[PDB]
Design a binder for these strands. Structure first.
Ligand SMILES: Nc1ccn([C@H]2C[C@H](O)[C@@H](COP(=O)(O)NP(=O)(O)OP(=O)(O)O)O2)c(=O)n1
Ligand SMILES: [Mn+2]
Length: 427
DNA sequence: AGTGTGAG
DNA sequence: TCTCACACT
């Protein structure tokens, strides 16, 4: 049987990233219930990032800041920079590149979102083991590490138990077996302590991190002791960890597919999947998903961490909901121009920084009365980083979905507009 | 090429 | 009352 202990993978995840980005810049928000918001007027603005101090009051993402203040009257607020009538995120993107560059010193990273990356440390863990000759690993090398499932067997303060668990782990490590997977997880955990130290001292940002054998475990582990902590999930921890883990908490099972794992099969927790055969799971979810599910519930995944530190697409979008929808040709032309303009800005910066040019532009629009995020999506060529050409071209390739017989109106009204650069080529 | 899913 | 990765057809 193949064990899934072949690689060492980590998932680093910035803590309340936007909140942190504003908190480094405005010291007045430090160590304070605090949230980041976009578009100030409707209900104070929508909250997309919450200080941990603020979360103790109930404040969550996707809350109207006015409601947020009903839970947390001293909630402090930063607002996302607006430009061209639109939210602009350049500060967090640039903040992100700060972090990704420091991470890259240690291994190749797969940028996963603006604020989290997977790491393959399999080989860096190798090298460290040789240089370790054979000497053990003192717990002083893992000041923020938690070992999931420990302590076991025969202190009530949160970090007090963290030390006893970390002691049990080390106390049973076969330091001499260079091929021992648990040993390599330990060595990985040591590296990311360093990696995390370097991020904090060189940017001021704190994050969390999971260390395990694939990306799904690393991601689930990283959540286990947020914030400013890092968790090691061993192959051995999985049966217990998964015995009560709701299926929806495993990455890619949060949506409809995980919903049908529950009702079809009639279970609640990841561990309950081991009683099914692969052919059984393939019967229900296709041959890729059953294969993926039969392994995953035993803690096995092979989705590699790809070498990809830059986004694969540069994209701009704005919604125009309610009666703010767009019912005029000139109105439609003006927001495309705005969007194309930010696009042109960001594109030019890309071409200079990463020696690459986008060759294909995707324009997409939603109409009031539809209910899927995209009503429509059609592509067109992108030959010049020129805001006027692109906005012109984007029109042409959507003009004909104006149902209204009169020229200067747009029926039905547009409630979403989207420009996106893609199909990159080295430059 | 064009849609839907999942996620931050 | 945004963003961007990916699988499928
Ligand atoms: N639905 C979402 C999720 C995230 N974001 C943005 C703002 C978030 O600070 C940033 C990363 O979000 P996140 O990783 O889901 N959790 P965020 O760093 O607030 O804090 P933690 O929950 O990781 O502590 O993406 C967003 O704009 N809309
Ligand atoms: Mn985060």
């Amino acid at each position: 049987m193949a064990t899934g202990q072949d690689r060492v993978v980590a998932l680093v995840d910035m803590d309340c990233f936007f909140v942190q980005v504003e908190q480094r810049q405005n010291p007045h928000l430090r160590n304070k219930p605090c949230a980041v918001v976009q578009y100030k007027s409707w209900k104070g603005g929508g909250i997309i990032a919450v200080s941990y101090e603020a979360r103790a009051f109930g404040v969550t993402r996707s809350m109207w800041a006015d409601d947020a203040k009903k839970l947390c009257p001293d909630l402090l607020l930063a607002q996302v920079r607006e430009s061209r009538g639109k939210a602009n995120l350049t500060k967090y993107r640039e903040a992100s590149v700060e972090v990704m560059e420091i991470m890259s010193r240690f291994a190749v990273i797969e940028r996963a979102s603006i604020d989290e990356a997977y790491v393959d440390l399999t080989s860096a863990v190798q090298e460290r083991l040789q240089k370790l000759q054979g000497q053990p690993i003192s717990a002083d090398l893992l000041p923020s590490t938690y070992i999931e499932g420990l302590p076991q067997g025969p202190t009530v303060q949160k970090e007090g138990m963290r030390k006893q668990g970390l002691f049990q782990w080390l106390d049973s490590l076969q330091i001499d077996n260079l091929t021992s997977p648990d040993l390599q997880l330990t060595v990985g955990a040591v590296i990311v302590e360093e990696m995390r130290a370097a991020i904090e001292r060189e940017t001021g940002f704190q994050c969390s991190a999971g260390i395990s054998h694939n990306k799904v475990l690393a991601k689930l582990a990283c959540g286990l002791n947020k914030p400013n902590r890092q968790t090691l999930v061993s192959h051995g921890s999985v049966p217990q960890l998964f015995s009560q883990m709701p299926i929806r908490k495993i990455r890619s099972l949060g949506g409809k597919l995980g919903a049908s794992v529950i009702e079809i099969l009639g279970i609640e927790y990841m561990g309950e999947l081991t009683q099914f055969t692969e052919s059984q799971l393939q019967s229900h979810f296709g041959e890729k998903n059953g294969s993926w599910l039969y392994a995953m519930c035993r803690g096995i995944e092979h989705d590699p961490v790809k070498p990809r530190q830059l986004p694969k697409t540069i994209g701009c979008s704005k919604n125009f909901p309610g009666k703010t929808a767009l019912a005029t040709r000139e109105q439609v032309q003006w927001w495309l121009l705005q969007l194309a303009q930010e696009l042109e800005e960001r594109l030019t910066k890309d071409r200079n920084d990463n020696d690459r040019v986008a060759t294909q532009l995707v324009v997409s629009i939603r109409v009031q009365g539809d209910k899927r995020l995209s009503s429509l999506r059609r592509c067109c060529a992108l030959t010049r980083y020129d805001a006027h050409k692109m906005s012109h071209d984007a029109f042409t390739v959507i003009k004909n979905c104006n149902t209204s017989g009169i020229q200067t109106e747009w029926s039905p009204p547009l409630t979403m507009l989207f420009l996106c650069a893609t199909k990159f080529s080295a430059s």
